[PDB]
Amino acid sequence: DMKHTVEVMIPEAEIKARIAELGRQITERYKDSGSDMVLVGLLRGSFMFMADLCREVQVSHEVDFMTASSTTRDVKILKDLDEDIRGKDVLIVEDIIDSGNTLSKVREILSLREPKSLAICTLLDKPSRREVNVPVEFIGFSIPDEFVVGYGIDYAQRYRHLPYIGKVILL
Amino acid sequence: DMKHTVEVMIPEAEIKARIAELGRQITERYKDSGSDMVLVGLLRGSFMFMADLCREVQVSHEVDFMTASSRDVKILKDLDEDIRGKDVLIVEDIIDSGNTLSKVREILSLREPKSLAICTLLDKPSRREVNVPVEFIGFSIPDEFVVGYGIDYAQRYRHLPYIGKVILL
Amino acid sequence: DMKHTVEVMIPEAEIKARIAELGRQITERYKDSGSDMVLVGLLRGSFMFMADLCREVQVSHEVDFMTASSTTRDVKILKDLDEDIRGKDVLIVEDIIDSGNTLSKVREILSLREPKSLAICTLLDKPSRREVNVPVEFIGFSIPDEFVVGYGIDYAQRYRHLPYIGKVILL
Amino acid sequence: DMKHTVEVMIPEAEIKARIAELGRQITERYKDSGSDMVLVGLLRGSFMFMADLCREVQVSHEVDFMTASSRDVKILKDLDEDIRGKDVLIVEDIIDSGNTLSKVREILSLREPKSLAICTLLDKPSRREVNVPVEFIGFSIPDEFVVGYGIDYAQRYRHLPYIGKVILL
Ligand SMILES: O=c1[nH]cnc2c1ncn2CCN(CCP(=O)(O)O)C[C@H](O)CO
Ligand SMILES: O=c1[nH]cnc2c1ncn2CCN(CCP(=O)(O)O)C[C@H](O)CO
Ligand SMILES: O=c1[nH]cnc2c1ncn2CCN(CCP(=O)(O)O)C[C@H](O)CO
Ligand SMILES: O=c1[nH]cnc2c1ncn2CCN(CCP(=O)(O)O)C[C@H](O)CO
Ligand SMILES: [Mg+2]
Ligand SMILES: [Mg+2]
């Protein structure tokens, strides 16, 4: 709770263009698989991104969601997937990776169910903060070490509905 | 699950146009409230609708989600945030019989929000078993079986950008 | 986290005797109903109490569990019942009621599903702290305004496994 | 769900006797560890067993619960507390095929507890599809269909104080 402003870091039209590209790449990757495919979103930050991305993926797939939450602390499953991923191409859709702990542990958890394949697509990557090295196949934007909001991403529950990515500026 | 096909019924552009109008209406009804606002989506069907709709709502608000299932309506995943004293708009993909939004409205009512309204993308008005008040409606449609824009048929077609009609063979 | 001791308030043999009585009363109440009956425990404090009580209930019933958690704050369902209670005699089994808010809201939530009947059985009642008046049909012990542990009830996660009820004494 | 009857197989007193021995064994194995201990029950079947067993364990520990379900093993309700760096004893009503405790052990393993052991009330050794290590066993039994002491038959008989055998007609 600090006096702040929001400033545009990635305008809406840039996000739209990037998601279109991610879309084409993802499609190219899975179009020939033949196995069932599911996009798994991590809630609730990733709802907007998932919504726009899955519309740009020209491959028949399912959409499902999982809610996880973690001074370390264990990553625990508040809400598991509705569907089985065994034998399917799974794509994990996340809003932001910075430390990597969360994606890292979630990938481990999902791998136990033996999907045909397992990959991650994150809209924003903040590598300056990476602690655990985790392989991310698809990245929309690598960004500077700034606290961003919008496009599903909140600051203290606020700003998820902004159609662009922006940064919180203090004082 | 039978052999079939999918035809466009509501093009992407018409949805986008309608959602913009819903945006203005919702903004208008809540612009002056002052209290905190939250849109609550019912997963999974409402996620896409929610994504486009909240972007058209020009009032500061929070976004939350809930997963309910039957039989008696049971909560698989409750809201993350409190809604007490707040303007709450439930966002849903379809109302048909009315059973779901009926029981969800009851449950959330107990938390004593400032206000409680419903916004549904699709209304099938016929076959209404329990009559629930819905303030905002995207489209009223006949008793057609549709898929797309979040709505599945046996887990398929959720990612279509249009509403489509399943055609059996 | 304070230096403390535990002292016996209700010895194990007293709890056993009381649960036996509660058992007989509950049995008397529902033996003629004919409708299905379910005992609903509130987790996780009530697991021990449920375990012992349901063994003293001579009526065919189901056992199910719910996990709820609440500066007020909303009572939210972390884990709902597995079974439907519509048309059944439902007995809510709780370890302690002191303020009453929790039982109060949980009863409201469960009533919406239209059980044949709805009642509460709590092992410990701390009425000096009652804020909301909530009707409790079955009570094991009304107790003084002391912080108790044991018999499923924790102090900072500690002491659930004690076979008796005791009080935490500071310094 | 067919017409049937229920006969005692393991009387209440024999269970109580066995659980006391399990108590001494578990206490012995963990008395000197120093690290924090937690018993983790898998709901619903294990709640009664857990209630009697934890009372016989003479080492400070926490009690936690987990609800899993299938197919792929999915978590309906995760633990409330962290188990990292702790001695964790999974408490379960029955191991048969081994699939359940297998996947649950994997999942919990990822949280990197100090140690990870299993205590099961009943072992049906036959029909073991995946071989999982179980440190503590109440009773090994034939491939009989039993109910009671937490164990249901179509949601019935969980509250019996003995283990019983269902007899079909
Ligand atoms: O700039 C930010 N805005 C808002 N949230 C952030 C930001 N930077 C990290 N977070 C937390 C995002 N994650 C942590 C990702 P990890 O460290 O495990 O790689 C928390 C959830 O994804 C919530 O979005
Ligand atoms: O054409 C359809 N496609 C896909 N789902 C449908 C359709 N017609 C009714 N449904 C079911 C919608 N359910 C039930 C609504 P209720 O009858 O309770 O008013 C809504 C659920 O949230 C699933 O989206
Ligand atoms: O002496 C106590 N020991 C341990 N926990 C307590 C005590 N007194 C109240 N609590 C909290 C118990 N409840 C609150 C009951 P409410 O105020 O809603 O009537 C919390 C859960 O039941 C956890 O057991
Ligand atoms: O006689 C029985 N009564 C009641 N349930 C049984 C019985 N025999 C196997 N089961 C199923 C026990 N499940 C599966 C154990 P797995 O085959 O995975 O090793 C255990 C679940 O936790 C349900 O209690
Ligand atoms: Mg559906
Ligand atoms: Mg069972």
Q: Does B31 touch chain C (CB under 8 A)?
A: no
Angle subtended by helix axes B47-55 and A47-56, to nearest 10 = 110
State which approach was used to obtain the coordinates. Answer: X-ray
Taking contacts as CB-CB distances below 8 angstroms, the residues of chain A near D103 are: 112
How far apart are the CA of D100 and the centre of ligand 4, in A? 9
DSSP string, C59-85: S--EEEEEEEE------EEEE--SS--
User: Chain A within 8 Å of B125 (Cβ-Cβ)?
Assistant: no
Q: Which atom of ligand 3 is nearest to the CA of C70?
A: 18
- Alpha-helical (H) ranges within chain A are 12-30, 47-56, 101-111
**C74 Cβ under 8 Å from any chain B Cβ:** yes
Residue type, C50: M
Q: D136 pairs with which residues across the strands? A: D119
B153 touches chain A (CB under 8 A): no
What is the Å distance from ligand 1's center to A40 Cα?
Answer: 17
Q: How far is the CA of A59 from the centre of ligand 1 (A)?
A: 29
Instruction: Show residues of chain B in contact with A43, CB under 8 Å.
Output: 65
- DSSP codes of every residue in chain B: --SEEEEEEE-HHHHHHHHHHHHHHHHHHHTT--S-EEEEEEETTTHHHHHHHHHT--S-EEEEEEEEE----EEEE--SS--TTSEEEEEEEEESSSHHHHHHHHHHHTT--SEEEEEEEEE--TT-SS----SEEEEE--S--EEETTB-BTTBSTT-SSEEEEEE-
Q: Is A48 in contact with B55 (Cβ distance < 8 A)?
A: yes
Helix or strand holding residue C117 (H, E): strand C117-125
Element (H, E) at C4: strand C4-10
Total number of residues shown for chain A: 171
Torsion of CA C119, C120, C126, C128, to 10 degrees: -20
Q: Given CB atoms, is D167 within the 8 Å cutoff of chain A?
A: no
**Which ligand number lies closest to the CA of residue B129?**
2
Strands (E), chain A: 4-10, 37-42, 62-69, 76-79, 89-97, 117-125, 138-142, 148-149, 165-170
Angle at A52 between CA A50 and CA A55, to 5 degrees: 100
Q: Is the CB of A147 under 6 A from ligand 1?
A: yes
Centroid of ligand 3 to alpha carbon of A145 (angstroms) = 43
Residue D169 CA to residue D159 CA, distance in Å, equals 23
The CA distance from A118 to A91, in Å, is 6
Q: CB distance from A28 to chain D under 8 Å?
A: no
SS3 C101: helix
Sheet holding C117-125, edge to edge: C76-79, C62-69, C37-42, C89-97, C117-125, C138-142
The shortest CB-CB distance from B72 to any of C77, C84, C105 is to C84
Q: Which residue of A has its CA nearest to D68?
A: A80
**Is D83 in contact with A74 (Cβ distance < 8 A)?**
yes
Partner-chain contact D76 A80, CB within 8 Å: yes
Interatomic CA distance for residues B63 and A151, integer angstroms: 11
Given A52, A95, A98, A125, which residue is catalytic?
Answer: A98
Choosing from B64, B80, B87, B96, the catalytic residue is B96
* Ligand 1 near A122 CB (within 6 A): no
Amino acid at D147: V
Which strands, in side-by-side order, build the sheet including C148-149? C4-10, C165-170, C148-149
CA distance A140 to A15: 8
For residue C48, the surrounding DSSP H or E stretch is helix C47-56
Residue D99 Cβ < 6 Å to ligand 4:
yes
Cβ separation C51–D54 shorter than 8 A: no
For the question of residue B1 being annotated catalytic, the response is no
Residue numbers in A near D66 (CB within 8 A): none
Residue of D164, D135, D167 lying closest to D14 (CA atoms): D164
Which tokens is B167 given? 């055609």
End-to-end CA distance of chain A: 11
For residue B144, count other CB atoms closer than 10 A to its CB: 11
Q: C145, C163 in Cβ contact below 8 A?
A: no
8 Å CB contact between C158 and C139: no
Distance D120 CA to ligand 6 centre (A): 14
The size of chain C, in residues, is: 171
- Using an 8 Å Cβ cutoff, are C65 and C81 in contact? yes
**How far apart, in whole angstroms, are the C-alpha atoms of residue C53 and residue A8?**
61
Contact B84 C74 (CB under 8 A): yes
CA dihedral for A83, A85, A90, A93, sign (positive or negative): positive
Phi, psi of A6 (to 5 degrees): -115, 135
Rounded CA-CA distance A19/A49 in Å is 8
Contact B68, B104 (CB under 8 A): yes
Which residues lie below 8 Å from residue D14, measured CB to CB, with a gap of 6+?
none
Closest CA to A106 of A148, A78, A131, A82: A78
Sign of the C-alpha dihedral computed for residues A92, A93, A98 and A102 taken in this order:
negative
Interhelix angle C12-30/C47-56, rounded to 10 degrees, is: 60
Q: End-to-end distance of chain C based on CA atoms, in angstroms?
A: 11
**Total CB pairs under 8 A between chain A and B:** 70
- Cβ neighbours of residue A34 closer than 8 Å, sequence gap 6 or more: none
What region does D161 belong to: left with phi over 0, alpha with psi -120 to 50, or beta?
Answer: alpha
The count of domains in chain D is 1
CA distance C152 to C144: 18
Give the span between the Cα atoms of D121 and C97, in whole angstroms.
Answer: 32
Q: What is the pairing mode between strands C62-69 and C76-79? A: antiparallel
**Given the CA of residue A147, which atom of ligand 1 is nearest to it?**
1
Cα–Cα distances in Å, from A133 out to A105, B17, C38? 12, 43, 49
What is the DSSP secondary-structure string of D122-164?
EE--TT-SS----SEEEEE--S--EEETTB-BTTBSTT-SSEE
Contact at CB, A113 and D72, closer than 8 angstroms? yes
| Ligand 1 and A99: CB distance under 6 A | yes
Q: Which residues of B touch C81 (CB under 8 A)?
A: 74
Chain C CB within 8 Å of residue D13 CB: no
Under 8 Å between Cβ of D82 and D109: no
From chain B, pick out residues whose CB is under 8 angstroms from the CB of A91. Answer: none
What gap in Å lies between CA A164 and CA A151, rounded to an integer? 6
Where residue D118 sits, what CATH number does that domain have?
A: 3.40.50.2020
DSSP 8-state class, residue A148:
E
Torsion of CA A21, A26, A28, A34, to 10 degrees: -160
**Three-class SS of residue C28?**
helix
- Rg, C-alpha atoms of chain D: 16
Written as six digits, the tokens of C120 are 């509460």
Q: Which among D32, D52, D64, D96 is annotated as catalytic?
A: D96
Residue type, D73: V
Q: How far apart are CA C38 and CA C50, in angstroms?
A: 12
Residues of D in contact with A67 (CB under 8 A): none
Please give, rounded to a whole number of angstroms, the shortest distance from the CA of A88 to a CA of chain B: 14
The greatest distance separating any two alpha carbons of chain A, rounded to the nearest whole angstrom, comes to 53
Rounded to 5°, the CA angle B52-B54-B55 comes to: 65
- Pocket lining: C59 vs ligand 3, CB cutoff 6 Å: no
Q: Which helix (DSSP H) or strand (DSSP E) does residue C41 occupy?
A: strand C37-42
Rounded CA separation D37/D33 (Å): 9
Given CB atoms, is B62 within the 8 Å cutoff of chain A?
Answer: yes
Query: How many Å apart are CA A65 and CA A103, to the nearest integer?
Result: 14
- Ligand at minimal distance from the CA of B145 is 2
Cα C28 to chain centroid distance, Å, stands at: 19
| Cα-Cα-Cα-Cα dihedral sign, residues A139, A143, A147, A152 | negative
Residue partners of B100: CB distance under 8 A and separation at least 6: B42, B68, B73, B92
Alpha-carbon distance D64 to D49, whole Å?
13
Q: Residue A119 belongs to what domain range? A: 1-171
Beta strands in D27-114 (DSSP E): 37-43, 61-69, 74-77, 87-95
The sign of the torsion formed by the CA atoms of C43, C48, C49, C54 equals positive
Q: Would you say the CB of residue C102 lies under 6 angstroms from ligand 3?
A: yes
Do the bridges between strand C76-79 and strand D115-123 make them parallel or antiparallel, or are there none, so unpaired?
unpaired
Q: How far apart are the C-alpha atoms of B79 and B91, rounded to whole Å? A: 13
